[PDB]
Design a protein around this ligand. Structure first.
Ligand SMILES: [K+]
Ligand SMILES: [K+]
Ligand SMILES: [K+]
Lengths: 187, 27, 557, 679
């Protein structure tokens, strides 16, 4: 009938033309930095956002979790994850290779590997590792930069968010904010 | 999918059609 | 590790009942047509300047108003995606979609499910997203409540023939339950770190030479009832693990609350209308006991994790693969039970990479009618197809007609709940049968072995039960999967709405009796101990041979 | 009447000939078991082709699958026909009484007329027929002339006889009972075909018994459970054919039958019959199954006073308190006045007053007993056997005829009206001259041990209400002797409809129970209408349930069957649905051990081979139908308890017994196939 169509045309404006507008106006009237991606910038250049995470193949940086998105790792145009199961033998091809690229790449660290540094992540855009794994890969990077552990552990604990309650999440070390500020400490 | 596969499907839909017809009736 | 594993469940339910109690009395007034404080006078304009006569209506007229809304619910959305290229707010140059991918998702957001078989940041523009997939994200969560408002009304009316009015209802759930609650849930996310803007995709020169193109767009508006309406359509490919949709742990704990916010307070609202508070309080006492058992299994099966990681020289056997390190395993294992028992479908962690003993419970809890703390809408009448089943085989072993809240359950109200239950284990046993008989379905698998069967089985189980979760290894961009699901989704919702209104229309013309010396007490730890025993058995005997070839065959190997 | 024969070794031999006459396509009205019939059909059709040429060749196995699935169908029709065969001889225990008669009638409507020789089947309604003593009653009717005692033993099994009256409240006489004492002239009220005995015959003898509306609602679950188990087994073949090689159909039909609730579809047609036969064995004639099934929920019952609570004899005798009159002279001439009281109510004071004295020192008509019957101008019966007059003074006509000579009583008799109010009786006044004897009252004489029965009925939680057309004064002393919950007097039969609709408007189910023609408007509108056997033959027809021994508390034996026809239906569902847990722990590690060998850890019961395990499931699904035939025939016994205290109890036996027993039954039968070591 007639008022049936007359309800939907009113529940097309308030629903998805007022409400997402009203969040957009109130998102930038109060929270200008986060609502635009929470970017970090160097003048005109943009050194990524504080949340997404980059590829850190270089030596003197903190390596993140392996991503395995579509074309390149840490590609935010796929945002997926490696959906390999436990019963897949192709999974052990990667993990035994991802330690073989990391056991003989951190020769002063533990023979054990932190599980975050070797397995993939969910979204493939994990900018965060645990502080144990952040403290695990200290003695190469301090050796690779001629820095001391006692300031680098102090540097890690600077960029270390923790949850409000100690079981809502996990303790978290950010990577992009660290490695961008690792080069500031280098200068 | 051989010739006997589509025989087994139509034997199910005969039974699945019969039990539905029994469910909508107080026979 | 279970010391901080037990505390997570008890914190999640403590805050839940404190928030769902004063919303239960909020939703109680809308069932009895009592206006909220403040909306009086405002609804005098909006129901008249638009024009809805507040005419009471029987169930046949009521059913072709929710269905009638959801026939031009997808007719707009199927045309906003084929004609996507001729639309504004496209900072990229995305074309019009294919007909199979459109019909897969034109069904999918009407159907309270939000199955996403596409990468959302390489498929959709903003106007395809904003005014096409939030306008249906409201009108599917409200479409489920306008059914379940007309079932709680069907237990309190006496010998009448009128449920209520649909358009008078639907203008209250959107304008005064969904919007003013998912506005604060939205604006909390921007503070915490989520995304809300209309900018084009901002390129990045990283700290190394590689570049990346960060997808921006209105997210936190679409994110708020992605969790509140138990709907689960993520803006990106990763439904709840992309950092712009869920930045910290605190957003995650709000989103876990936002799933069980309507279908928990809607059962407290069920206690208010019947008069007996304990009548609805036992119903959570039957849902949440299945939930706590089905979390302690999954948390135990993921602390144990992949056993191969110890042999490969890692630190622990903890299955951190496919889980965001922002979140724990204990938080990820909690979410993947909340998002699958409750028809939400927000993936926080890719469900393939679970252990098969812990990946079976999120595939259990979909297949068992989508009942245990289920979706907005389907959480209560999905349980009322099992309450009205457990009243039958309890009252009949007393020597008594199966009375529930005074209303008797006659033959006409068992010819329907048989046909109402039988929709969801038909399609997950016909679709999973059909997709294993063909080559267009089996070639879309990702993992080999018994787990590759579980990807077919998890997919069609999150189509008839209207979840929206996915193993996501199943590359379901074929025209077979985009149309097999779209059949199995449209029937899995609207083949349950019709035999619930036909139940509800048959329970208004009856007369509620009073309690006496011999009527069975529905409240209490016996009938709850039977209602759990009826849910976990009819959902057990009908899926063990489907699960014993899936992940049980994977786990024992 | 032994009332219980499970295997009388002649019914079961006459049963198997009829069970094999249920195998062809007439089982399709039982869809739970009809799938098992097709399940037993094609497993032969597989094994016959497997015997000559097929892709597998294990014909010695699959012919043993079909060698028990037909046995499962043969056991479902066994229990279905056994209760039907039970009700054959149950009806033939009284059917063989009606055809043993042939009549004779009087052509004038008085006793002592012209006779004939006419067989009893040729009679109709409205025939002046004569039955002298010593014969059997050929046809039903009302007694209009004569009063005698009859032996109602052939139709309901009684040691004792029962008396009758002409034109009072003993108009009930049933064709087939022996007459003992005197002659009776009755007029037939029914016809052959409308016969009270035909009510039991055409219901039992034939498949005309429709399903009750709770048996119907149970099959809808028992269909909907087979709809899933059709899907969740016949789609296991595409689930299994992908990984490795497939699973044979010979298992997927055995798995399909072992999950279908076969132990109810074999017994649901047997419960609905054997429950109705237990009703007849408790001397209660049920018109349909619906009034039995509705009787489990009844919380309000009603009773008549005249005939239902008491024997309907409307008579008593207590004393003669009088100044100057001796206690020895109680039955001096009042007994003679009771011999003058030629009504059968007057026969009580002959009998009931002498039960302390037995002063039998007189003769019938030796002292010139002028037997004057019930008159018209005085409305009484008297005798001039003393020198004075002896007349039964009525309520008002004490002054009109008996104390019409001017002589009256000192005021004790004025307070005897007050003693009627202290008694609640239907009094009779006798005054012989100036010597006022006073009042011999006639209260009512309520028969059985009803005090324990109403106490047993209050534990079942049913309100007891007395309903009479007589005044409030009589209902006081009767209710105190009865022990009813409530009472209500002064009710027309229209007002008796105005109480049933004062409870049916409240949603409750109403159990009217009565005998009279005033009961017949209330009986034809109430829910459970139990008509007494002493009642009028228009009230039995207008009701919906007729007792055979005039027991008012025999509704207790009705609710004890209307619950047993539900407790047996409910328990076997949660027995059979709980069975399927251990069925998957017998089939699934055995059915897929060719394809998935890693499922062998799910074999909890340590079953021997992946073929005998499936054979143990089909045999256990076939045996446990037979071992629950004594459950489907003898009902489920129960303490009369509350709801939530019995539902706890009724799941230890079934909701937990349905789990553990198949974990026992598969172990034992596989051990029987290991000690014998066959397969
Ligand atoms: K999804
Ligand atoms: K559902
Ligand atoms: K079912």
């Amino acid at each position: 009938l007639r008022p049936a169509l007359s309800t939907f045309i009113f529940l097309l404006l308030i629903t998805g033309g007022v409400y997402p507008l009203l969040t957009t106006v109130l998102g930038q009237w109060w929270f200008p930095w986060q609502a635009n991606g929470s970017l970090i910038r160097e003048g005109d250049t943009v050194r990524g956002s504080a949340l997404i995470g980059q590829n850190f193949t270089g030596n003197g940086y903190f390596h993140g979790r392996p991503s395995a998105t579509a074309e390149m790792p840490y590609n935010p145009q796929a945002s997926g994850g490696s959906n390999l199961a436990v019963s897949n033998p192709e999974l052990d091809k990667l993990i035994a290779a991802r330690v073989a690229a990391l056991r003989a790449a951190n020769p002063d660290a533990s023979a054990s590997v932190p599980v975050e540094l070797v397995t993939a992540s969910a979204s493939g855009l994990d900018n965060n590792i645990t502080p144990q794994a952040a403290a695990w890969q200290i003695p190469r990077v301090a050796k690779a930069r001629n820095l001391s552990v006692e300031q680098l552990t102090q540097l890690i604990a600077k960029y270390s968010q923790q949850p409000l309650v100690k079981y809502i999440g996990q303790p978290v070390v950010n990577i992009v904010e660290l490695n961008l500020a690792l080069d500031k400490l280098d200068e | 999918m051989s010739a006997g596969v589509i025989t087994g499907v139509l034997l199910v839909f005969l039974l699945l059609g019969y039990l539905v017809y029994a469910l909508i009736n107080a026979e | 590790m279970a010391a901080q594993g037990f505390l997570l469940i008890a914190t999640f339910l403590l805050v839940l009942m404190v928030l769902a109690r004063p919303l239960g009395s909020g939703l109680a007034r809308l069932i009895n047509d009592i206006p909220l404080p403040g909306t009086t006078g405002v609804e005098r304009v909006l129901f008249r300047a638009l024009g809805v006569s507040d005419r009471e209506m029987n169930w046949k007229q009521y059913l072709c108003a929710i269905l009638g809304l959801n026939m031009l619910g997808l007719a707009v959305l199927f045309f906003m995606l084929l004609g996507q290229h001729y639309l504004p707010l496209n900072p990229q140059q995305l074309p019009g979609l294919s007909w199979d991918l459109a019909l897969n998702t034109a069904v999918s957001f009407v159907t309270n499910t939000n199955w996403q078989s596409y990468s959302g940041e390489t498929t959709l523009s903003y106007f395809s997203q904003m005014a096409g997939l939030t306008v249906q994200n409201f009108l599917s969560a409200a479409s489920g409540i306008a059914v379940i408002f007309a079932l709680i009304r069907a237990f309190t009316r006496q010998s009448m023939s009128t449920l209520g009015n649909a358009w008078v209802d639907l203008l209250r759930i959107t304008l005064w339950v969904l919007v003013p609650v998912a506005l604060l849930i939205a604006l909390f996310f921007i503070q915490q770190g989520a995304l809300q803007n209309f900018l084009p995709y901002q390129a990045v020169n990283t700290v190394e030479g590689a570049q990346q193109l960060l997808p921006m767009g209105p997210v936190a508006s679409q994110e708020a009832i992605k969790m509140l309406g138990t709907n689960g359509g993520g803006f990106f490919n990763a439904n709840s693990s992309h950092p712009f949709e869920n930045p910290t742990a605190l957003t995650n704990f709000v989103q876990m609350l936002a799933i069980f916010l309507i279908p928990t307070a809607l059962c407290f609202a069920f206690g208010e209308v019947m008069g007996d508070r304990r009548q609805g309080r036992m119903l959570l006492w039957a849902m949440s006991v299945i939930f706590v058992i089905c979390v302690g299994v999954v948390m135990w099966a993921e602390v144990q994790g992949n056993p191969h990681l110890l042999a490969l020289g890692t630190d622990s056997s903890i299955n951190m693969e496919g889980k965001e390190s922002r979140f724990g395993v204990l938080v990820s294992s909690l979410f993947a039970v909340v998002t699958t028992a409750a028809s939400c479908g927000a993936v926080i962690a890719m469900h393939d990479s679970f252990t098969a003993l812990g990946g079976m419970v999120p595939m259990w809890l979909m297949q068992i009618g989508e009942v245990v703390f289920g979706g907005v809408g389907s959480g209560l009448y999905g349980m009322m197809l099992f309450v009205l089943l457990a009243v039958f085989i309890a009252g009949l072993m007393i020597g008594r007609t199966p009375e529930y809240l005074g209303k008797k359950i006659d033959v006409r109200e068992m010819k329907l709940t048989a046909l109402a239950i039988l929709v969801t284990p038909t399609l997950v046993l016909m679709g999973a049968a059909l997709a294993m008989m063909t080559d267009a379905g089996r070639s879309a698998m990702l993992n080999p072995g018994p787990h590759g069967f579980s990807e077919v089985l998890y997919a069609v189980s999150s189509a008839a039960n209207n979840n929206g979760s996915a193993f996501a290894g199943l590359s379901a961009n074929s025209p077979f999967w985009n149309c097999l699901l779209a059949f199995c989704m449209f029937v899995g919702r609207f083949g349950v709405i019709i035999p619930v209104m036909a139940i509800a229309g048959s329970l208004v013309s009856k007369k509620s009796q009073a309690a006496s010396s011999g009527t069975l007490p529905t409240h209490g730890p016996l009938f709850v101990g039977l209602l759990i025993g009826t849910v976990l058995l009819v959902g057990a005997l009908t899926f063990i041979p489907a699960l014993a070839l899936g992940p049980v065959a994977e786990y024992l190997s | 009447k032994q009332l219980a024969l499970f295997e009388p070794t002649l019914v079961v031999q006459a049963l198997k000939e009829a069970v094999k006459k249920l195998n062809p396509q007439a089982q399709w009205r039982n869809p739970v078991m009809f799938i098992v019939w097709i399940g037993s059909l094609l497993t032969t059709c597989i094994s016959i082709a497997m015997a000559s040429g097929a892709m597998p060749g294990n014909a010695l196995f699959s012919a043993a699958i079909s060698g028990w699935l037909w046995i499962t169908v043969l056991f479902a029709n066994f229990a279905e026909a056994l209760a039907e065969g039970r009700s054959k001889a149950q009806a033939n225990s009284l059917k063989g009484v009606k055809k043993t008669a042939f009549a004779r009638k009087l052509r004038e409507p008085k006793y002592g007329a012209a006779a004939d020789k006419v067989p009893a089947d040729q009679l109709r309604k409205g025939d002046i027929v004569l039955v002298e003593a010593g014969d059997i009653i050929p046809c039903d009717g009302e007694v209009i002339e004569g009063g005698a005692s009859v032996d109602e033993s052939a139709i309901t099994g009684e040691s004792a006889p029962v008396i009758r009256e002409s034109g009072g409240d003993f108009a009930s006489v049933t064709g087939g009972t022996r007459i003992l004492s005197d002659w009776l002239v009755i007029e037939c009220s029914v016809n052959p075909g409308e016969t009270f005995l035909d009510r039991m015959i055409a219901m039992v003898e034939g498949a005309q018994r429709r399903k009750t509306p709770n048996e119907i609602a149970l099959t809808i679950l028992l269909i909907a459970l087979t709809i899933v188990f059709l899907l969740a087994t016949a789609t296991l073949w595409p689930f299994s054919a992908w990984g490795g090689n497939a699973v044979s159909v010979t298992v997927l039909v055995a798995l399909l039958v072992c999950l279908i609730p076969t132990t109810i579809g074999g017994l649901l047609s047997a419960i609905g019959v054997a429950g109705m036969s237990r009703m007849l064995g408790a001397n209660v004639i049920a018109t349909s199954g619906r009034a039995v099934e509705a009787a489990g929920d009844v919380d309000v019952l009603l009773l008549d006073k005249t005939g239902t609570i008491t024997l309907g004899n409307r008579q008593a005798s207590e004393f003669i308190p009088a100044q100057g009159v001796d206690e020895k002279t109680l039955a001096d001439a009042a007994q003679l006045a009771s011999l003058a009281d030629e009504t059968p109510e007057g026969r009580s004071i002959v009998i009931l007053a002498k039960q302390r004295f037995n002063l039998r020192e007189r003769d019938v008509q030796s002292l010139h007993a002028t037997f004057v019957p019930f008159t018209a101008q005085s409305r009484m019966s008297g005798i001039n056997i003393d020198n004075r007059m002896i007349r039964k003074g009525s309520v008002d006509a004490i002054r009109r005829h008996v104390e019409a000579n001017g002589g009256h009583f000192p005021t004790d008799v004025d307070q005897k009206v007050d003693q009627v109010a202290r008694q609640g009786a239907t009094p009779l006044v006798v005054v012989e001259g100036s010597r006022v004897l006073g009042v011999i009252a006639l209260k009512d004489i309520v028969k059985g041990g009803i005090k324990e029965r109403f106490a047993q009925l209050r534990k079942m939680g049913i309100k007891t209400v007395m309903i009479t057309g007589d005044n409030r004064l009589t209902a006081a002393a009767i209710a105190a002797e009865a022990g009813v919950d409530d009472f209500l007097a002064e009710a027309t039969p229209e007002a008796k409809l105005a109480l049933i609709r004062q409870y049916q408007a409240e949603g409750r189910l109403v159990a009217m129970t009565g005998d009279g023609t005033n009961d017949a408007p209330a009986l034809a509108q109430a829910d459970v209408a139990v008509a007494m056997n002493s009642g009028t033959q228009a009230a039995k027809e207008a009701g919906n349930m007729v007792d055979l021994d005039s027991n008012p508390t025999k509704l207790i034996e009705v609710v004890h069957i209307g619950k047993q026809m539900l407790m047996t239906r409910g328990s076997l569902t949660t027995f059979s649905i709980a069975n399927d847990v251990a069925k998957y722990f017998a089939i699934i590690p055995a059915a897929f051990a060719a394809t998935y060998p890693q499922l062998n850890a799910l074999n909890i019961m340590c079953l021997h081979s992946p073929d005998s395990a499936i054979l143990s499931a089909v045999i256990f699904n076939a045996l446990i139908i037979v071992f629950l035939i004594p459950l489907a025939l003898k009902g489920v016994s129960y303490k009369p308890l509350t709801a939530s205290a019995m539902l706890r109890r009724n799941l230890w036996i079934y909701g937990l017994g349905g789990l553990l027993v198949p974990f026992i039954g598969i172990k034992v039968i596989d051990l029987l196939l290991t000690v014998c070591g066959l397969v």
